[PDB]
Amino acid sequence: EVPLPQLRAYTVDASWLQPMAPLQIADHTWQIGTEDLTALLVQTPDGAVLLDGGMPQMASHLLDNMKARGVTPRDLRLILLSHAHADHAGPVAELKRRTGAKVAANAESAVLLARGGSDDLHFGDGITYPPANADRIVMDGEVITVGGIVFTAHFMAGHTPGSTAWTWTDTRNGKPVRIAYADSLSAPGYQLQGNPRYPHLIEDYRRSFATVRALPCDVLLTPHPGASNWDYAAGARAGAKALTCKAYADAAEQKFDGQLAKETAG
């Protein structure tokens, strides 16, 4: 007698779960997540924005870092997402319960967020998290303005259908810094060709490489910092080795072409 298997929790590298203090990126923009997951806090005179929250169990750490920055729960106005996987949108439901924040996302991300990442096109129910509702649906190229910082959505479907880059202009040393928070361009274990759940997967990825290459991009940040060669633990040198958006897109495309060739061979 063999019982059905136990449910398996979504476990990750310890660095993904390693708390860090807030690391300033530009005058209004801070990394407040963990060593290996991005969660960006943007502070304005008219409230704060969070872009991604990381894993589900990061909610309280995020709230601590906001507090350290001067941002109370009522000051958090808006949550934006790169994509609605558990390691980026994980604590969103809880953050909505514990703060004033409302979520803006595109339709694809909203429907995946609302089912807590279940029935994923590639992962099935293997990587789920508490579901949350979007409060605003955004379209490609739409802007959201908070405390006068202007965030623009750039859709870059592929990693998930709803993958989005967010761009905004901050400052440092009195000069503008065009920040591009580009989503993942990876396809981990995905069936790329002839996938019945995502028939135009390859065309979407190619289009997304071109989108990312062309972003306004003085500084690139990514949901997994290593993807853009950030090292959040490296202090004053954390961003020193960061890729350009062009280099990030080129590397992702070369990796993707390799994966396609391997899929054909396997």
Summarize as ranges the residues that interact with a second copy (CB under 8 A).
Answer: 1, 3-12, 14-19, 34, 55-58, 61, 93-94, 97, 114-116, 118-119, 125, 128, 130-131
Residue of 129, 181, 190, 248 marked active site: 190
Amino acid at 71: V
Q: Look at residues 225, 81, 96 and name the one whose alpha carbon lies nearest to residue 163.
A: 81
For the segment 79-98, give every residue that binds ligand 3C7 (CB under 6 A). 85, 87
Structure tokens at 26: 């530009």
Q: Look at residues 219, 226, 191 and name the one whose alpha carbon lies nearest to residue 205.
A: 191
**Is there a catalytic annotation at residue 159?**
yes
**Is there a catalytic annotation at residue 36?**
no
Q: Residue count at the site for Zn ion (CB under 5 A)?
A: 2
CA angle 44, 134, 144 (to 5 degrees): 35
Q: Look at residues 110, 123, 114, 119 and name the one whose alpha carbon lies nearest to residue 164.
A: 110
**Is there a catalytic annotation at residue 200?**
no
**Any binding-site annotation on 183?**
yes
Please tell me whether residue 36 binds Zn ion under the rule CB under 5 A: no
Which listed residue (118, 186, 195, 229) binds ligand 3C7 by CB under 6 A? 186
Q: Which stretch binds ligand 3C7 (CB under 6 A): 30-38, 131-139, 180-188, 201-209?
A: 180-188
**Any binding-site annotation on 122?**
no
**Any binding-site annotation on 46?**
no
**Is there a catalytic annotation at residue 85?**
yes
DSSP 5: P
- For residues 196 and 198, what is the distance between their CA atoms, to the nearest angstrom? 6
**Is there a catalytic annotation at residue 224?**
yes
Q: Look at residues 187, 172, 169 and name the one whose alpha carbon lies nearest to residue 227.
A: 187
- For residues 176 and 62, what is the distance between their CA atoms, to the nearest angstrom? 27
| E-only strand ranges, the chain | 23-26, 29-31, 40-44, 47-51, 76-80, 102-105, 136-137, 143-146, 149-155, 164-172, 175-181, 219-221
**Is there a catalytic annotation at residue 250?**
no
- For residues 228 and 71, what is the distance between their CA atoms, to the nearest angstrom? 28
Sequence-ordered list of residues with C-beta below 8 angstroms from that of 257, at least 6 positions apart, any chain:
none
214 binds, among a second copy, Zn ion, ligand 3C7, none (CB under 5 to 8 A by kind): none
- For residues 178 and 181, what is the distance between their CA atoms, to the nearest angstrom? 10
19 binds, among ligand 3C7, Zn ion, a second copy, none (CB under 5 to 8 A by kind): a second copy
**Is there a catalytic annotation at residue 13?**
no
For the segment 192-221, give every residue that binds ligand 3C7 (CB under 6 A). none
String marking each residue 83-112 x if it binds Zn ion according to CB under 5 A: --x-x-------------------------
Nearest distance from C-beta of residue 92 to ligand 3C7, angstroms: 15
Q: In terms of CB distance, is 117 or 239 closer to Zn ion? A: 117
Annotated binding site for substrate: 183
| Binding region for ligand 3C7 (CB under 6 A) | 85, 87, 184, 186, 188
Annotated binding site: 83, 85, 87-88, 159, 183, 224
Q: Which residues are tagged catalytic?
A: 83, 85, 87-88, 159, 190, 224
Annotated binding site for Zn(2+): 83, 85, 87-88, 159, 224
